Amino acid sequence: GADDVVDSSKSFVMENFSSYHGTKPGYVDSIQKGIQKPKSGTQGNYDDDWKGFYSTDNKYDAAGYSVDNENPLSGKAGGVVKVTYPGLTKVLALKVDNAETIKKELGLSLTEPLMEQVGTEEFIKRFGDGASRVVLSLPFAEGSSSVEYINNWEQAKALSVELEINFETRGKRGQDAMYEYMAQACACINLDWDVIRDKTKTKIESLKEHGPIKNKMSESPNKTVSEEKAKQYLEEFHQTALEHPELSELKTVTGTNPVFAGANYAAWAVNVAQVIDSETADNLEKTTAALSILPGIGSVMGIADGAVHHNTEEIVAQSIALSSLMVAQAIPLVGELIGFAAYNFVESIINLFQVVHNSYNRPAYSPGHKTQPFLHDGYAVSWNTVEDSIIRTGFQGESGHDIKITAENTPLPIAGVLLPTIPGKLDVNKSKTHISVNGRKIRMRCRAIDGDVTFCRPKSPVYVGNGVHANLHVAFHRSSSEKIHSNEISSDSIGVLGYQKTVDHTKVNSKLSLFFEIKS
Ligand SMILES: Nc1ncnc2c1ncn2[C@@H]1O[C@H](CO)[C@@H](OP(=O)(O)OC[C@H]2O[C@@H](n3ccc(=O)[nH]c3=O)[C@H](O)[C@@H]2OP(=O)(O)O)[C@H]1O
Ligand SMILES: [Cl-]
Ligand SMILES: [Cl-]
Ligand SMILES: [Cl-]
Ligand SMILES: [Cl-]
C-alpha cells in the first residue's frame, strides 16, 4: 500500500509551491516563457518511468546543473529559475526510488510509465488530498539535506517561471559567477578571483624581471632533457623564486608543511608539461580535463590535513604565479608547445581551486567507512553497506548501489568509474548514476567499453581528500524480465579510476576495484 512507499511526514499540500531549476546558457530567457518537454533527448531520464521535469528546493544545488553540456568542465554557466505552481500542489515523498516497487505498492499500471501516471486525473484524485497536481519528492543526495522534485511533464505546463539568477549577466570570467553564488550557501572560503588573476599577473611579471631568477632561467637546458634533470632544475628554480619579495608570505608557510615543498611544485610542473600537447594547450576545456586528473594539486592549492591553508587572495596568487612560472620553465624541458602557462594554465587551475574550495565549504560527508575499505594510492573505497555489494538476481525494475570514496590527505581526483552490465538484461541508468561530493551531486557521461563494462566520467571535476568525501551511486536498470544468473555477468567488479600516473613509460590511471556478490 501507499504507506509502504510514501513518507507521510514529508508529504503535504502547499499553496504556490515553488522550487528551483538549473538552466543552461541559451535557455535562461526562453525557459521563463514556460516549462515544456523537449521534443527529443532523455526528457528528464534514461528510464521512461522517470521522464519528467526536475527541480529542487535548493537553489545552490540547482546551480549545479547550469553548465554548458558541450563544455562541462570549463564552459559557461546559465542560471537558476524559480518555478511555482499556482493553486494547491501535493508533494508526495517517496521512501524508495524504484519505479516498479512504487507502481506495485500504489496499485498503478505496471505497463505505463510511473511519471506519466502521476499526472493523470485518477492519480491526482487518489493521492492529491485536494490539490490540482502531484509532484514526487526524493532525497537529493547522500551528504545533502536537499530535496529532488519530479514533475509530470504535462502538469508542469502550469508552472510560472521566474529568474533567480543569470550567471552570464554578471559578465565575469570562467565559472566565477556560479562559484561565487554557491559560496553564499556557506557564508567559508569566498575569494575574489578577479583580484587573484591580477595579483597573479603582477607577480609573474615581477618575477621575470628578477636578477637571480632570469639568471636561473639562463641556466636551463632549454631542451628536451629527462624528467630527473627537469625536476632537479625546477626545484632549484623554486628555491630561487621563493626568496623574492612578492612571494614572502609563501616562503614563510612553505617549511610549515611537506605538501608545499618545492619538490612537489616541481613534480607538478613537470607533470603538467608532460600532458599538455599543442591541441590541448589551445583549448581550455581539454586543458582542464587534463589537469583535473593529475595528482599533487594540493601542493599548489596549499591544501593538506583537512584544511585550506592558502586562504587569501594574496597567497593563492603567489602560489599560482610561482606554479605558472615553473610550468613555463618545464615546457621546453619535457613538454612540447607560447603563452599557455600564464593563460589557460592559470584559467584552468583557477577553476579547479574553485571546485575544491566549494567542496571544503560544504559539510564533510560521513567520513568513516562502514565496511572494510580497499586501500590504494591514497584512496579508500568501500561498499556503503553490505547490501550495496549484492546484486539480487530477482530484483525488479532497478537497483541502486552506494560506494564511499575517500582519500587520506591532499585532494586526489576521481577520473571515472567502470560499471558492469549484462547484455540487455542489466544496464546502467545513465541519468540516476552519479557522484556526490560532500553533498554536491555530479552527473556523469557514460559510454560502453570492452567486456560488458560501461565507463562513466563525472561532468565536473571530482576530488576527495581529508574533509572531502564522496558517494558513488550506481543505478542499474532491468531492461528484461528474463532472470539473471550468477555466472551470466562478464565483469563482477566496479572499478574506480584515480589520478593519472606513469607505468612502463606510459600514462595510465590509478585503479581500485570492489567486487559484487550476485545472489538471490
Ligand atoms: N522550457 C523548458 N522547459 C523544460 N526544460 C527546459 C526548457 N528549456 C530548457 N530546458 C532544459 O531541458 C532539459 C529537460 O528539462 C533540461 O536541461 P538538460 O541540460 O537536459 O539537463 C540535464 C539533466 O539535468 C537534470 N536537471 C536539470 C536541472 C535541475 O535543476 N535538475 C535536474 O535534475 C535534467 O532533468 C536532465 O536529466 P537527463 O539528462 O537525465 O534527462 C532543462 O534545463
Ligand atoms: Cl547537468
Ligand atoms: Cl548520493
Ligand atoms: Cl541575474
Ligand atoms: Cl594502479
Side-chain angles (χ1 to χ4, degrees), residues 1-38 40-68 70-204 206-335 338-424 426-444 446-481 485-486 488-520:
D3 33 350
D4 295 299
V5 289
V6 176
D7 186 350
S8 61
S9 70
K10 301 191 178 167
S11 301
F12 58 90
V13 181
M14 185 175 270
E15 196 172 23
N16 293 132
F17 174 68
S18 68
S19 60
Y20 300 100
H21 179 87
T23 306
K24 315 290 214 285
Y27 299 95
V28 175
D29 290 316
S30 57
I31 202 162
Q32 293 173 66
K33 300 296 299 169
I35 305 308
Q36 160 82 46
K37 182 175 77 166
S40 58
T42 33
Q43 302 158 335
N45 222 262
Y46 174 91
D47 180 340
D48 290 351
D49 283 306
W50 291 114
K51 282 169 160 63
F53 179 74
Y54 283 72
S55 61
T56 171
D57 71 332
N58 182 312
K59 68 193 182 177
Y60 303 118
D61 289 311
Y65 289 92
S66 69
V67 179
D68 173 16
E70 291 188 337
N71 294 285
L73 307 179
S74 81
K76 302 310 180 180
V80 176
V81 300
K82 177 187 201 173
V83 298
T84 303
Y85 282 111
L88 297 180
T89 299
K90 168 69 178 283
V91 171
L92 193 72
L94 318 161
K95 288 194 303 190
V96 301
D97 78 327
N98 186 312
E100 184 79 7
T101 302
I102 295 155
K103 290 184 307 187
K104 292 193 182 272
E105 292 296 343
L106 301 190
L108 303 188
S109 199
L110 298 192
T111 66
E112 302 297 333
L114 173 58
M115 281 306 303
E116 291 196 12
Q117 297 189 70
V118 169
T120 57
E121 280 184 328
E122 186 162 34
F123 188 91
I124 294 166
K125 195 67 184 208
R126 288 172 71 204
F127 296 108
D129 293 328
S132 291
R133 83 291 293 177
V134 180
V135 174
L136 306 185
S137 89
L138 284 165
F140 185 75
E142 297 293 332
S144 198
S145 69
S146 306
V147 187
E148 174 181 63
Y149 298 117
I150 312 183
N151 299 267
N152 165 273
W153 272 119
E154 184 74 9
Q155 298 294 347
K157 294 168 154 179
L159 288 161
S160 74
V161 185
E162 288 171 27
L163 185 63
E164 202 50 50
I165 181 163
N166 180 335
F167 293 128
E168 295 195 89
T169 302
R170 309 316 171 110
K172 295 205 103 160
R173 293 301 302 284
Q175 288 178 1
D176 286 10
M178 182 182 82
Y179 283 108
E180 181 169 329
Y181 187 65
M182 290 173 169
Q184 304 174 8
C186 195
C188 302
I189 319 289
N190 181 207
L191 303 179
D192 187 332
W193 287 101
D194 280 326
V195 165
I196 287 162
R197 272 184 196 87
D198 171 54
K199 290 188 175 231
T200 306
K201 296 183 71 206
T202 302
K203 276 154 180 341
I204 288 173
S206 283
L207 293 152
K208 301 180 161 180
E209 266 156 48
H210 190 61
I213 275 142
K214 55 177 143 147
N215 275 342
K216 176 84 218 170
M217 283 163 183
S218 299
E219 285 169 35
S220 170
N222 217 121
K223 67 98 98 308
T224 296
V225 298
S226 63
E227 170 179 293
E228 290 73 32
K229 274 165 206 164
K231 290 179 182 152
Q232 180 54 39
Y233 167 76
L234 294 169
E235 297 178 33
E236 292 159 11
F237 186 97
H238 167 284
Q239 198 190 102
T240 288
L242 205 52
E243 292 311 330
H244 196 315
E246 307 270 332
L247 298 179
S248 63
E249 291 87 324
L250 192 52
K251 181 181 114 140
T252 284
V253 308
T254 280
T256 298
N257 196 290
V259 174
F260 314 150
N264 282 338
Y265 271 83
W268 171 263
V270 163
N271 201 346
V272 175
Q274 284 182 324
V275 308
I276 300 299
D277 51 27
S278 264
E279 282 177 21
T280 304
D282 293 334
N283 185 278
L284 180 64
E285 175 75 13
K286 288 176 184 185
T287 286
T288 305
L291 300 184
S292 69
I293 59 176
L294 300 184
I297 206 171
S299 297
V300 185
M301 301 188 179
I303 303 175
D305 309 315
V308 179
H309 292 94
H310 300 358
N311 60 349
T312 49
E313 288 92 344
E314 168 66 20
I315 71 206
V316 163
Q318 291 176 28
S319 188
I320 294 173
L322 182 53
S323 179
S324 169
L325 188 64
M326 293 182 62
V327 165
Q329 293 300 120
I331 282 179
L333 301 181
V334 306
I338 304 156
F340 169 80
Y343 202 108
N344 273 349
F345 168 78
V346 163
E347 296 303 315
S348 182
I349 205 177
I350 276 173
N351 177 289
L352 299 174
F353 272 79
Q354 284 162 342
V355 171
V356 179
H357 284 174
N358 177 265
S359 290
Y360 274 99
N361 276 347
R362 291 171 190 266
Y365 170 55
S366 174
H369 294 271
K370 302 323 199 176
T371 66
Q372 197 171 259
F374 178 65
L375 309 165
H376 190 62
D377 283 341
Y379 305 92
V381 300
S382 64
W383 297 109
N384 198 51
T385 67
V386 185
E387 186 60 28
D388 288 289
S389 78
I390 300 157
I391 296 176
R392 294 297 178 172
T393 271
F395 81 93
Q396 295 196 336
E398 59 194 298
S399 203
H401 307 272
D402 296 310
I403 290 162
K404 185 167 294 181
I405 306 168
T406 66
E408 59 191 3
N409 175 12
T410 65
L412 292 188
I414 302 296
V417 304
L418 300 164
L419 307 182
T421 54
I422 303 179
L426 176 81
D427 306 316
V428 171
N429 179 325
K430 305 195 183 154
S431 288
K432 296 181 68 172
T433 294
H434 66 261
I435 301 177
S436 306
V437 183
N438 286 357
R440 181 189 191 175
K441 181 147 67 164
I442 303 163
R443 292 294 294 256
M444 315 211 73
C446 307
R447 68 183 203 272
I449 64 162
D450 303 341
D452 296 327
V453 174
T454 291
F455 172 59
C456 299
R457 187 186 300 273
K459 167 184 169 151
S460 311
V462 175
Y463 294 89
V464 290
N466 180 334
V468 176
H469 318 121
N471 187 64
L472 172 61
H473 183 78
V474 182
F476 294 116
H477 169 85
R478 177 145 210 158
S479 78
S480 181
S481 89
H485 312 96
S486 39
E488 196 176 0
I489 201 165
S490 311
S491 184
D492 72 324
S493 58
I494 290 178
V496 181
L497 295 178
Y499 56 85
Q500 191 187 52
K501 57 183 187 179
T502 315
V503 168
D504 194 32
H505 300 115
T506 305
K507 294 296 170 173
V508 305
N509 281 86
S510 177
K511 184 169 174 190
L512 297 90
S513 288
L514 289 180
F515 297 92
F516 268 120
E517 189 193 350
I518 291 179
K519 70 200 207 188
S520 62

